[model samples]
Target: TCPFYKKIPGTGFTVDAFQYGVVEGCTAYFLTHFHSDHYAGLSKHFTFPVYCSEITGNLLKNKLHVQEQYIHPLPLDTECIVNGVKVVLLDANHCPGAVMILFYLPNGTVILHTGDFRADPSMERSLLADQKVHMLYLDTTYCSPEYTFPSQQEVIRFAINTAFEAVTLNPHALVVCGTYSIGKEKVFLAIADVLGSKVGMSQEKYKTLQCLNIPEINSLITTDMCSSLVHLLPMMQINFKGLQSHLKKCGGKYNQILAFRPTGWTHSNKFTRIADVIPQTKGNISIYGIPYSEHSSYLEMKRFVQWLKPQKIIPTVNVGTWKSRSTMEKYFREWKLEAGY
Candidate 1:
């Protein structure tokens, strides 16, 4: 029930999509990333002029069959104009080619649409210096006190070490790592580096990465399953039945499989201060859901809001029937009270 599209009143500018009750008569559209949820109503045979990152533009053409004429590619850190408004694209750090849109409205107000990003402290100097954000479209996927996950780097290292240790203990074991089709290539690449083995990926996924032109994965990816112990599978393919069917192809050559799913939902209900790599055994598969996410935690969100001090903060998820201001106040109060601010 999130607001898939937003309109800046008096500007006639639309964001994200044109469907789902959003006015379709806007001058231009902006896409933050290529996530299906973000680009919900976009498709082939469509004719709306849209702006997004270059990588996203490539993916739209190659994967979704979108025409190039309607797609405007925006490079990171560059400024462009659409509908007489200045726009800048910044790295969102969520996935490959993801961006945070900075809009310089005609009335001298700066609006920031953080598509979906983990707030990196290093970005403050460049992104926040001498800038006043009037409004913030927040990605509040983890806007609660219970979602305290560790940093992505730390969790990636922990997952790598745990998977390696498991493989060392069971030489015949296979390591199956879960990841999105585009994001988390770093985790897969790190696993391959530590295990000294090539990564096995589907031809489709390999082509996706190839289109991205990433040098780190271009030489290390392979299609042959027999060549490596580390298999990079989609998040959906890491389930029990999926692993069972895959293990059948191994013909008992592997005694066990250690599956690592890097996610934030591993400790959603538990009261915990920090996230760590914990292994859970289920049948023959030892699965570990490492605390890894690209969205901001509640504490992090509070800190970012405190830093920006925007006039209004809009939550981008689960906006069923409540007023935006009411939702912001509710979450902001929860964030402050939980953080003892």
Candidate 2:
């Protein structure tokens, strides 16, 4: 006999594109987190209102530009009934504003859908909130033992030390490192902590700080953050002529530049397109290379699953990747839970 609570293994299943229809004939759907993979199918197939955390709803609405008419935001610590299905969101603690979706059926079945997330003590509150979970949809991004990713604190330490080294090595050279406006704010904070009092930012980054409501680096003068060193002047990317002219008007020289960005320019878009367009500039441009990654380790995942003995488990959003499959199979086999029947 199957171990999981229900006959159907997973409610919200994966599809090729942003559309899907569950084989289980489940009437409701819960969009757990803000990641594209999690909400990919919500746009097309499901006529039901997509349930998500408030922050996640706002981000999906504004950032991804999803249609709001079908969006049903599930605020934290509360439950909302969607199409007769009770859904609650718990803090995922994977990112600044991520969440896990817990679904409660009329039959007293409770299923939790955890989107791309990390298992940490930060989520102690959510864990204690609902002790009676029947099923769990987990993040298997770091399922393999090889993926022993360093801790958040440790990554920050590395960034800090590297930034310090750059400052010490080249005082006049400009230092530049890449981070997205949303995902990698920690990198900038680490840089700031590294540079300490000497922290400064570029005008554009300062503008970004202002526009983005970034309270962390609001008063800073340098934009690159301490990802660049004291020896390296802070440099920012001029994506348009307006920014270029503005920097020029401010007596910013074109020569002191740092090229810190995704290889193809524009975070992992097209690599071959940028092969011919590598712009050349003068001055000491220090290319500080550091591999930055996010997500918890496999051990962390195992600990979480053991602590929360769920009813049924489904690995969604990502299941094709080697690590993803490995994680899914390991937990599935270990738990020996069947898809809900």
Candidate 3:
């Protein structure tokens, strides 16, 4: 039996433990986004019909290239019936495929399970529609007082400026921007839009752009499509030092480079390694510590949960745990602080 299916001795109400395994008798395992943490446990788990929006499905099918047979595609705001559960996949505004799921439990409980999400009113309204929320499995990653994220708009502006300035300085060198392979694609494209074709990204961006569809859903990329500018695509890699050396050695060095990089990323930064390389690789590399993040900041999260005003706002993500999990917790706590509850 999967952890998620524990019996509630008397009430017969079951609590599904958040462990990764089969998806047996349930309607669907409502995933919030494409981040590895939330969806990694999905294997031969009970084929209880997987649910995700088209964008998320594309990510699962195309990006990760998973061949799971039970994937039932749902779009943002659209409701679908799987097994006996009525599921709604709302836009989370966290990542491109991020969503807030509304599960119509058999016991008449409309449990709103928020995968990693933000409280942007506009974003919330767009995907949320008019459904009433009962329970909130919120994301409280940045819940602690120690966390904060710069506004996405601010991050975009900073990235654009960095790219623009860098281009002006070295228009001939390959301007490479470091970004999360799964989440930063839109950020890279957004910056490219602002810079326009004249100050576009390096060759990698150009190629990646050709492969992806412009204007990711619920994201600012829609604005990018309307703009006349051609944004650059991105490459998927983490080895900055080796890439830097390769770029430097190759004579066609670019002059200006605008990289939308995460803070303190290094050439040797491995997923499970403690060895820090950001300081060691700090050379002619001009890096920007822009706070562009997909997850909501502590404040943003706190504000959102207040609006929904659920009874128990138990968060999923956390710190000293997993970055993604931690971020979710921060957002949840921030929401709690504001409501004064």
Best by lDDT: 1
lDDT of candidate 2 at residue 332, scale 0 to 100? 60
Residue 108, candidate 3: alpha-carbon lDDT: 69
Provide the lowest-lDDT 10-residue window in model 2.
Answer: 263-272
Which tens-of-lDDT digit does each residue in 204-302 have in candidate 3? 434333333444422333323223233233334324554565455445444322334555222232221222212223455443334556666556765
Task: Report the C-alpha lDDT of model 2 over 21-93, residue by residue, as the tens digit.
Answer: 5534544444555555445555433455555666666665665556787666766767666555556667776
* Candidate 1 RMSD computed on C-alpha atoms after optimal superposition onto the true structure: 3.1
Better of 2 and 3 by TM-score: 3
| Model 1 spans > 4 angstroms off | 1-5, 272-277, 321-328, 333-341
Task: Estimate the TM-score for candidate 1.
Answer: 0.89
lDDT of each: 0.76, 0.51, 0.53
What is the TM-score of each predicted model, taking all chains together?
0.89, 0.63, 0.70
Model 1, 1-341: lDDT tens digits are 32433766556666676455445556677777777877877778778788889988888888778898999998778778887888889888888888988888888989888888887766676555568988888787776667677777777778678778888888899989886757777777888888889889788877677667576665688888888888878788887888888889888889798887877555542654334335677688877776667788777777777767777677776555566446556878665565553
Question: Better model by lDDT, 1 or 3?
Answer: 1
TM-score of structure candidate 2: 0.63
